[PDB]
Amino acid sequence: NLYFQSNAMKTVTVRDLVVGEGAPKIIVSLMGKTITDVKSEALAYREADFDILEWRVDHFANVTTAESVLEAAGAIREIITDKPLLFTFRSAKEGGEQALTTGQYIDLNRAAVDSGLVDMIDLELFTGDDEVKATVGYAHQHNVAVIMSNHDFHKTPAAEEIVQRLRKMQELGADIPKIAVMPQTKADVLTLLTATVEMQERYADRPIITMSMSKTGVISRLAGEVFGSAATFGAVKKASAPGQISVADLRTVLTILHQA
Amino acid sequence: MHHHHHNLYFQSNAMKTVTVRDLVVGEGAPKIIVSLMGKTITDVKSEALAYREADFDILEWRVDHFANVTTAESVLEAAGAIREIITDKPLLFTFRSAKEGGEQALTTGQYIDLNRAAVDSGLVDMIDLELFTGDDEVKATVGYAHQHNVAVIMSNHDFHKTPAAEEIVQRLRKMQELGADIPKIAVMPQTKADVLTLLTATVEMQERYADRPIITMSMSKTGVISRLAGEVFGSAATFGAVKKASAPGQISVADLRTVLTILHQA
Ligand code: NI
Numbered sequence: 001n002l003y004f005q006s007n008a009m010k011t012v013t014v015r016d017l018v019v020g021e022g023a024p025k026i027i028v029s030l031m032g033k034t035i036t037d038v039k040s041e042a043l044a045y046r047e048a049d050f051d052i053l054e055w056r057v058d059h060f061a062n063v064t065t066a067e068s069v070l071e072a073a074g075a076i077r078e079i080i081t082d083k084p085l086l087f088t089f090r091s092a093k094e095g096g097e098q099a100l101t102t103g104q105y106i107d108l109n110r111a112a113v114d115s116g117l118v119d120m121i122d123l124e125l126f127t128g129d130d131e132v133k134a135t136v137g138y139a140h141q142h143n144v145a146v147i148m149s150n151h152d153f154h155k156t157p158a159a160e161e162i163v164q165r166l167r168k169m170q171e172l173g174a175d176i177p178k179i180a181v182m183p184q185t186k187a188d189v190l191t192l193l194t195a196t197v198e199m200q201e202r203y204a205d206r207p208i209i210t211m212s213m214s215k216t217g218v219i220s221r222l223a224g225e226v227f228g229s230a231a232t233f234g235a236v237k238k239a240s241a242p243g244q245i246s247v248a249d250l251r252t253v254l255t256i257l258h259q260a
Numbered sequence: 261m262h263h264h265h266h267n268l269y270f271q272s273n274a275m276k277t278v279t280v281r282d283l284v285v286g287e288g289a290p291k292i293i294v295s296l297m298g299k300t301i302t303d304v305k306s307e308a309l310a311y312r313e314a315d316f317d318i319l320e321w322r323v324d325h326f327a328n329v330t331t332a333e334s335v336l337e338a339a340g341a342i343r344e345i346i347t348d349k350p351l352l353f354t355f356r357s358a359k360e361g362g363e364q365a366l367t368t369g370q371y372i373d374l375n376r377a378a379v380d381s382g383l384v385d386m387i388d389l390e391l392f393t394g395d396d397e398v399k400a401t402v403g404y405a406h407q408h409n410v411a412v413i414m415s416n417h418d419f420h421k422t423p424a425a426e427e428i429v430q431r432l433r434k435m436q437e438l439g440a441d442i443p444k445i446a447v448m449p450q451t452k453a454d455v456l457t458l459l460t461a462t463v464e465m466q467e468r469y470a471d472r473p474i475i476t477m478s479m480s481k482t483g484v485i486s487r488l489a490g491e492v493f494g495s496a497a498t499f500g501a502v503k504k505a506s507a508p509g510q511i512s513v514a515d516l517r518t519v520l521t522i523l524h525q526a
Pocket residue numbers: 262263264380408
């Protein structure tokens with residue numbers, strides 16, 4: 001599992017994929033309740049064009065059973081063999097389907113890191129600073145990269161607050177700070193982009209991932225190359241968050257912008 | 261002082277649209293404008309015939325590239341040629357002055373007389389008038405175009421910097437005050453933030469002050485996204501390239517229509 005990190009070039013390289021270089025990378029979210037459902041979805045996703053596979057563990061029914069989680073991850077790794085695998089338990093208040101105690105959520109990520117089956121984990125910043133910092137270090141001890149994340153599905157904080165949150169993620173050791181916000185106005189989309197630019201140019205020594213959700217915020221999913229967001233989420237069969245477009249349409253736009 | 265004894269465009273203030281040759285500017289996905297440049301009447305004809313096959317909505321004739329811009333009748337001969345060739349799309353007459361990057365310079369009197377001649381001809385559906393021409397002549401010429409059912413795109417360009425958002429909004433508002441049917445502004449980013457400043461101005465103008473469509477763009481490769489996001493931010497049209505870009509940042513019409521269509525999906 002070794003991944004690379006170049007602070008000077010602001011890149012994170014996982015499975016030969018250079019996040020932070022060139023056109024933004026496409027992340028898709030795989031959801032399945034049972035082990036066989038995860039296999040089925042992995043076989044379907046193997047036919048799609050994406051760069052990073054995110055397993056949304058909060059959609060899995062047996063999330064507190066260690067052996068079941070490990071079996072599902074192994075199944076994905078056996079089907080999708082050449083793309084980085086990102087392990088994400090999204091909490092209900094951050095956009096997901098389930099909620100765990102802080103301890104259960106650490107056990108779960110701990111076990112994912114230990115297995116060697118996943119290349120990256122997602123850690124929610126709000127989990128708690130001590131908890132998060134320790135877990136980041138642990139992931140790094142095992143050659144697992146961390147996407148640190150924060151999501152607001154109702155509003156867009158001020159740009160200064162968005163920047164500060166991305167700076168803290170970096171301070172806590174996130175390899176890739178990530179923030180998703182919801183616009184209530186057209187200007188809010190621009191606020192998210194402003195924060196992206198400011199963070200990326202003034203403070204980051206690594207890639208960042210940002211997005212303004214809903215149809216109104218779609219542009220933020222497409223303009224990463226210019227504004228400084230290193231990856232973007234697309235939909236394979238169904239959108240996992242408001243505003244995602246199909247992977248095919250997303251790749252089309254990213255390519256056009258890259259070659260403009 | 262212009263008098264009529266005893267072209268057609270529509271505009272809806274409340275819907276914020278301008279309709280010319282059945283094209284509804286301000287509704288749905290942004291419209292694509294392409295620019296035709298030719299030095300002689302022979303070059304204009306060859307380029308119009310060639311462009312006829314392209315996917316665009318509005319044809320802009322860049323009169324400043326024409327060598328014989330000095331005798332109005334000669335300019336009207338080329339306009340007729342384009343009108344005979346492109347019969348079903350709006351034709352925008354644009355002499356882009358030396359002050360704003362035009363390949364040429366003309367005195368204000370010559371510029372006003374050229375645009376009056378274009379209006380008189382009935383061969384063009386719209387004229388471009390530069391905001392910075394001078395208020396008395398702009399107002400008079402806007403009124404003159406309107407008397408003839410010719411729409412006006414009022415324009416302003418900065419190829420070296422992006423003014424503050426407030427200044428961009430003031431210019432768009434002034435265009436509306438002067439009677440422009442479609443205010444239009446193009447600015448050049450020096451930083452990534454400058455691209456966002458142009459979009460901020462677009463949103464504020466469109467939401468708070470406009471009762472008509474506006475056209476805005478941040479030039480260069482850096483500003484390309486501004487040419488693509490008009491549906492959400494409020495820019496009603498966008499310039500594309502048929503064979504070669506006519507301003508920095510334009511992409512091919514095929515790529516532009518592809519992206520616009522994706523963004524319009526719902
Ligand atoms: Ni008359």
